[PDB]
Nucleic acid binder design. Structure first.
Ligand SMILES: [Mg+2]
Ligand SMILES: [Mg+2]
Ligand SMILES: [Mg+2]
Ligand SMILES: [Mg+2]
Ligand SMILES: [Mg+2]
Ligand SMILES: [Mg+2]
Ligand SMILES: [Mg+2]
Ligand SMILES: [Mg+2]
Ligand SMILES: [Mg+2]
Ligand SMILES: [Mg+2]
Ligand SMILES: [Mg+2]
Ligand SMILES: [Mg+2]
Ligand SMILES: [Mg+2]
Ligand SMILES: [Mg+2]
Ligand SMILES: [Mg+2]
Ligand SMILES: [Mg+2]
Ligand SMILES: [Mg+2]
Ligand SMILES: [Mg+2]
Ligand SMILES: [Mg+2]
Ligand SMILES: [Mg+2]
Ligand SMILES: [Mg+2]
Ligand SMILES: [Mg+2]
Ligand SMILES: [Mg+2]
Ligand SMILES: [Mg+2]
Ligand SMILES: [Mg+2]
Ligand SMILES: [Mg+2]
Ligand SMILES: [Mg+2]
Ligand SMILES: [Mg+2]
Ligand SMILES: [Mg+2]
Ligand SMILES: [Mg+2]
Ligand SMILES: [Mg+2]
Ligand SMILES: [Mg+2]
Ligand SMILES: [Mg+2]
Ligand SMILES: [Mg+2]
Ligand SMILES: [Mg+2]
Ligand SMILES: [Mg+2]
Ligand SMILES: [Mg+2]
Ligand SMILES: [Mg+2]
Ligand SMILES: [Zn+2]
Lengths: 97, 139, 108, 275
RNA sequence: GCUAAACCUAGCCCCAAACCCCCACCUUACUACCACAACUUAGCCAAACCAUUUACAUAAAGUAUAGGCGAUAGAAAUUGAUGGCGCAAUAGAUAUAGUACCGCAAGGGAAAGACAAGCAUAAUAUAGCAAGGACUAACCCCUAUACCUUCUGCAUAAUGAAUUAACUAGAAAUAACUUUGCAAGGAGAGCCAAAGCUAAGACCCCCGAAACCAGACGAGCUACCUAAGAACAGCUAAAAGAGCACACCCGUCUAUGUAGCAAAAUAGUGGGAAGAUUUAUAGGUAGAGGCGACAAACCUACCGAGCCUGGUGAUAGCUGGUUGUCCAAGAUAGAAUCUUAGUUCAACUUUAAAUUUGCCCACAGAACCAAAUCCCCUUGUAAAUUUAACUGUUAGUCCAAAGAGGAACAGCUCUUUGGACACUAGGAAAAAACCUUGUAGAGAGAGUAAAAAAUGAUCCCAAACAUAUAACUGAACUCCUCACACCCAAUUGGACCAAUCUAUCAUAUAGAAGAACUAAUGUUAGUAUAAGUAACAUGAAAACAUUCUCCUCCGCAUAAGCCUGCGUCAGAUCUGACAAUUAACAGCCCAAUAUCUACAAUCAACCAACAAGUUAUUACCCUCACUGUCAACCCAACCAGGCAUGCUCAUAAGGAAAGGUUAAAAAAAGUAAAAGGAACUCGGCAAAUCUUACCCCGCCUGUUUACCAAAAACAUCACCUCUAGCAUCACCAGUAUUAGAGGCACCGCCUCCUUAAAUAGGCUCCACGAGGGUUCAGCUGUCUCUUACUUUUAACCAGUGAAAUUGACCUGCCCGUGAGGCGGGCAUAACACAGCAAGACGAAGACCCUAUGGAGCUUUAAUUUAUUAAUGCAAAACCUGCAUUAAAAAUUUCGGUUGGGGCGACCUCGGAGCAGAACCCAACCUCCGAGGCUAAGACUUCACCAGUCAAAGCGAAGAUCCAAUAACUUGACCAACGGAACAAGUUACCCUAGGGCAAUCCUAU
């Protein structure tokens, strides 16, 4: 048996808190603001991902370049190993040549 | 764990419910219930053909019994009722033999009559007048 | 060798619950007609035997307390007498093992 | 804990379903469960049978003295006695007429027995459960006792008669009560004992000597599964033939078949004409 | 009804921001207190080997450039810069914890907290993949060869699964296609643009080697060595690697044991036992290294190369797996390849799109030297070609036919035309390959197709029938009433969708993603089966004080090790509290300087030897502190094993071989045995008895393969050969009668009988041998030929209670097919218990082949001299740089078809029969050689790369890369001739991944 018996507590979502009521506001700051700013300049998050996209290999390479010299030793060694593996995989393994 | 099947129970019971009436461990253990249930449904599908074949052979047997009760084999009865243009099938012939003996007696008499007419005609020389029951009716 | 297939619960039930393996109901129990305790026919009433062994042990404790140490098997018969029982006329010249409780009704 | 809600609710519903198979609830009046309005229900009862019941008479044909008394006692209008009497009396008379005209030779004892069977509790309750009389009828005890269903059913027939006249009521009776004779043999409704005596009586009334019982056919005389075919005769002419395992039982069955043939109630009689 | 099943949070993951924190302790760490020093990543991995080589903001740009110009590598100038569609106790950190526990060590590394399977209630009744058609009826009747994966299909041919629950396997570009925006321009700079641009949508898995390299940890086992210690009774013999034989050490032969008492023991029988012996204690040698009386022996249970961490998610042309529903199209030309276990191209398949001919096909037509084939007008048809875009299959089996090879046979290799199979269904018995039949659902309707015999070895095999009119029976084929996408592998297209999160509703529309398990000897947890089976334990009586019977190479102490581990009390069937082991024994030491310090020990005296074994001066008049002290004990996971020394030598000390019973088999140990005494057997193994003789090998004692070989191997005195003229770390505080390295093995001598019978036995050279062979005599249950009794085991009662194994089983025999399960016969009420070993291909170890797997060994296989040593030349009597020669190593590889694998040939191109008549078609089948320029259209060696013909017109009559080159272009090798730039022999020590109807003849009529 892998199914619960009593009902879960009700997850109450407040669809009108501040974060949801104001979602998206200023996502047209460029078109409606004389192009002073750009939408990407509102993306809050990692230093090395604000307004950029890519597969895991490119993401790891970018992380190494921009914060590789600030990383803890073991995390950085893991990152280098990961880049090595992904290089081998994306460049030698796969259905399509 | 991001996504885990939360309802594997119902997918199991969909297959066990068809196995409660089995015998052994293969009525509560899925790994065996599945194989035997699948064999069960395959036989269930494939068995309709045999159902038709078997009911027809039962009817042929019952009709042979009834027709032998009146001194007349089964080849004669069917092969000489059609020569009288009676399209009674075999299900209803069996039902008549069991549940209406005298009607079947009459049908057997008719078959023997037509058989005799055929023998008499073939024994003769030429196209002498056809038998009183051997006259076909056209559409 | 080793088994080639698990044995099902059905075969195991036809073996384990076969009559030859069941515990038989005993046809030889009854009640001590006088004493009124359970007993088998060919065996002593357990309660009576225990109440006899207790007195035998007490008598033997007195015997040990009187003989002193080991290696003192007497060369005469022995008689045991309970309270208020003078040595009878037949028991003179036989060692007496005094006890300090009224003689049991079952001691004849 | 697996995160989710759908499987939990689905399992709760399945548990409730299982819990409503073991320990089912005590059955209760359909007039208490949800989705009930008496007026629409009674009007639909009318229109369903293809009959133009007068609404007031039909309303008072489903109310029983028990219900009136219980309402009077529970509080700290007409009842259906008269309609029930009219309906029962008319039903008896009309069934007698039907059976007499369909089966002329049958004796008055047999016709009265058939009429008691069809208007009895065993068949009236069956015809009253499968036409929603128990749902509309007012009483104390649920399920309504079969006697109360019977008296309410004939109250409804009485309302039908007082409303739409005799002929339509006769069609109603032909449609629901007489149909119950379908398949039943005669002596499954007219329960009798000592059939040979009754055969001898009827044959005497027609001035012919009592029948001689012979042994027509037999197989397995000595075994434990015999078959004796006993054939009554009446001055060298057969009038019946019966099977059995004992010769006594075969003679009894020969008497039963002879009685059926004389009373015109055979297995292959002209089937009742409903058109 | 038990067992269980359920839950939330304790916490954690990824971001953002901010730069983070009394005493004792480097000696033996956690100890109050005395005279040296630290300062290039190799290689797994790609190139399908491998050797140069191979990765550690945006844009310019994957451009310049580098590169066996292969795989791949790759700039710069300039440009400009508090949170969560995260986990929620098998997840998230390994975490309640780096604790418990494993390991000597480096190091490894957990678990968990809040009516599923299994059973009981309730054992079963002929028959059989356990179901289906059904039926009034559970069985009985008819039908019916388990699932996954791999091989051409596989009856199970083989692999995997006891069973439940949880967790467990498709990540992304280049183009294309679809839908939006804008459109000669698109885009929020860099880019593209001859309808394109911008955005989105779609597509590329999991587990597993032996290995390699680097840095740590290990000599508490074992090999050897060092320092300082210890043991060796008694007898015989007196200075001896002496004889018999205890302690001690080893481990010859047999039996027990084989998850055992023990991951190598027990009992007997054996070799040594004053020495080359054995042994306690501390130290040393460290992994291509150590050590080695060389056996590839040993270096912490597994060493032809330790172990741990890291590179490491090594790589794997090899094995195994790969998870919802439904539909549809869908299969066997060939070429090259260090290549035939694989890849690329083609052929075939699929989708989308464009266009118009495609298939069949008569008459005509295709050479000189039988079947048929090619080509098209019509005709029946509706398909075909072309374009854009991907994957997948590829060298299959059987049957008819024509050939080549082996007879015209060997169920034989190969080529060709056709069919079938790997797709449905019915028949010939079972039946992939023969005959009949396809497009799919419901029917309790119908018509047919194919389809029946004539006249040697367990146990024959449907039962029967000579003569009543020939028709009937028979499918998923066809018709009938209704409904329709609803029967192929690999692959490809499409329509739906379970559950979770997010946005908006507040189950739907969308967006997302750790998104679905009948299967990886998967992992974790639960419970089964074998199974209440195998195995284990407590001497007797009693008055619980005691007495009795029997046993021990045992016991007491110190040492080493361990650390409170049967003392009291109180709770239970082990938990807590309390208590204890008192120094005289043992450890913990020493003020400095100079001086000395020749002769053994052995009852130490006789003989005899060799292995040769502290004080004087100066300074100090201080006193007992500190620690060990227990036990039934330590190393072996808990234990018939291992454990140094002193003393008791059969016990003053210590213990208990039988839980109760009965006295079956088979098994184990022992005792006895008539007559005969090796006739057993490979052999006198075992046992009983104690004698003799020879032969082979080795001179002797000794040493060796811890755990299958103790030897005829190693070592060894003796002899011989080679090298070396000599200082303070080995040889060596040595010096040619010395030291090191080799061969051989003292010494002397030379450089026909046996048996009745027989394939066995019969350079000299004493002594010795658990060495090998033979013989005499004896002895005996080895045997002729077994038998009895005892003990353990055993069987039963009572307690405690495993493990391999297991798809499901409702688990028969015979014959046939290719066997408990299929077919045809036979048999058949259910159920324990004890036996047996014919069958369930019943549950480790070998042998053959393969891999452009791994690791070696040798070399006269290729490449090198980096390191060392000589020289030679420059550099200021020594070191630095360059060159040559060598040794020492280091890296690296082992082409293809094949008698029977090996031997040996051949490997590219060309011509003749197979392949009779367009094209093509194999051979280690059949027979032989070769190494002027421009330009419509075409042919081709079944791909590509190459190759071939050519009207007109103008002018004259064996690849790529590299080097030399101004050049016009040029060559050898690449002949393994689609070519690694340069690599052989071999693995009896090998390791991993895997695969496995007879020409010639024998015999009878
Ligand atoms: Mg049919
Ligand atoms: Mg490589
Ligand atoms: Mg955890
Ligand atoms: Mg964990
Ligand atoms: Mg259950
Ligand atoms: Mg089998
Ligand atoms: Mg298995
Ligand atoms: Mg040592
Ligand atoms: Mg891998
Ligand atoms: Mg391969
Ligand atoms: Mg299809
Ligand atoms: Mg043509
Ligand atoms: Mg069809
Ligand atoms: Mg839904
Ligand atoms: Mg998943
Ligand atoms: Mg599994
Ligand atoms: Mg057993
Ligand atoms: Mg036992
Ligand atoms: Mg002390
Ligand atoms: Mg002292
Ligand atoms: Mg002590
Ligand atoms: Mg003692
Ligand atoms: Mg004992
Ligand atoms: Mg015992
Ligand atoms: Mg003897
Ligand atoms: Mg020796
Ligand atoms: Mg020896
Ligand atoms: Mg027991
Ligand atoms: Mg067989
Ligand atoms: Mg048995
Ligand atoms: Mg290869
Ligand atoms: Mg290799
Ligand atoms: Mg040729
Ligand atoms: Mg060719
Ligand atoms: Mg070509
Ligand atoms: Mg020209
Ligand atoms: Mg080649
Ligand atoms: Mg070639
Ligand atoms: Zn008593």
């Amino acid at each position: 048996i892998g199914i619960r018996l009593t009902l879960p507590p009700p997850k109450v979502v407040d669809r009108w808190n501040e974060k949801r009521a104001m979602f998206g506001v200023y996502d047209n700051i460029g078109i409606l603001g004389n192009f002073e700013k750009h939408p990407k300049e509102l993306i809050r998050g990692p230093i090395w991902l604000r307004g950029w996209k890519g597969n895991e290999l490119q993401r790891c390479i970018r992380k190494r370049k921009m914060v590789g010299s600030r990383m803890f030793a073991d995390d950085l060694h893991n990152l280098n190993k990961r880049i090595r593996y992904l290089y081998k995989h994306f460049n030698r393994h796969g259905k399509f040549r | 764990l991001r996504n885990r099947v939360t309802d594997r129970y119902f997918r199991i019971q969909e297959v066990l419910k068809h196995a409660r009436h089995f015998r052994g461990r293969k009525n509560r253990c899925y790994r065996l219930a599945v194989r035997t249930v699948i064999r069960a449904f395959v036989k269930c599908t494939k068995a309709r053909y045999l159902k038709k074949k078997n009911m027809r052979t039962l009817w042929i047997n019952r009709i042979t019994a009834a027709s032998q009760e009146h001194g007349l084999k089964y080849p004669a009865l069917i092969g000489n009722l059609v020569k009288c243009q009676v399209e009674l099938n075999r299900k209803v012939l069996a039902d008549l033999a069991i549940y209406e003996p005298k009607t079947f007696k009459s049908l057997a008499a008719l078959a023997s009559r037509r058989r005799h007419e055929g023998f008499a005609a073939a024994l003769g020389d030429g196209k002498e007048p056809e038998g009183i029951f051997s006259r076909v009716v056209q559409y | 060798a080793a088994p080639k297939n698990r044995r099902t619960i059905e075969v195991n039930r036809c073996r384990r619950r076969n009559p030859q393996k069941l515990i038989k109901v005993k046809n030889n129990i009854d009640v001590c007609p006088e004493c009124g305790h359970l007993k088998q026919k060919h065996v002593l009433c357990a309660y009576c035997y225990e109440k006899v062994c207790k007195e035998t042990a007490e008598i033997r404790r007195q015997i040990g307390k009187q003989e002193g140490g080991p290696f003192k098997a007497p060369t005469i018969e022995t008689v045991v007498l309970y309270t208020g029982e003078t040595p009878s006329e037949q028991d003179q010249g036989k060692r007496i093992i005094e006890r300090d409780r009224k003689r049991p009704s079952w001691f004849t | 804990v697996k995160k989710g809600f759908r499987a939990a609710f689905r399992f709760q519903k399945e548990l409730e379903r299982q819990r409503l198979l073991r320990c089912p609830p005590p059955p209760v009046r359909r007039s208490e469960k949800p989705n009930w309005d008496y007026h629409a229900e009674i009007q639909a009862f009318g229109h369903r049978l293809q009959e133009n019941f007068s609404l007031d008479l039909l309303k008072t044909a489903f109310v029983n003295s028990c219900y009136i008394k219980s309402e009077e006692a529970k509080r700290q209008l007409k009842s259906n006695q008269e309609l029930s009497e009219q309906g029962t009396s008319f039903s008896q008379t009309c069934l007698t007429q039907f059976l007499e005209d369909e089966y002329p030779d049958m004796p008055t004892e047999g016709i009265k027995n058939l009429v008691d069977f069809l208007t009895g509790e065993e068949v009236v309750c069956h015809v009253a459960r499968n036409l929603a009389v128990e749902q509309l009828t007012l009483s104390e005890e649920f399920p309504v006792p079969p006697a109360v269903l019977q008296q309410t059913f004939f109250a409804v027939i009485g309302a039908l008669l007082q409303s739409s006249g005799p002929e339509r009521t006769a069609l109603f009776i032909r449609d629901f009560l007489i149909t119950q004779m379908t398949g039943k043999e005669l002596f499954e409704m007219w329960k009798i004992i000592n059939p040979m005596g009754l055969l001898v009586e009827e044959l005497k009334k027609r001035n012919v000597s009592a029948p001689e019982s012979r042994l027509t056919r037999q197989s397995g005389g000595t075994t434990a599964l015999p078959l004796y075919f006993v054939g009554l005769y009446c001055d060298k002419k057969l009038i019946a033939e019966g099977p059995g395992e004992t010769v006594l039982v075969a003679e009894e069955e020969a008497a039963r078949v002879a009685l059926r043939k004389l009373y015109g109630f055979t297995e292959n009689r002209r089937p009742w004409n409903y058109s």
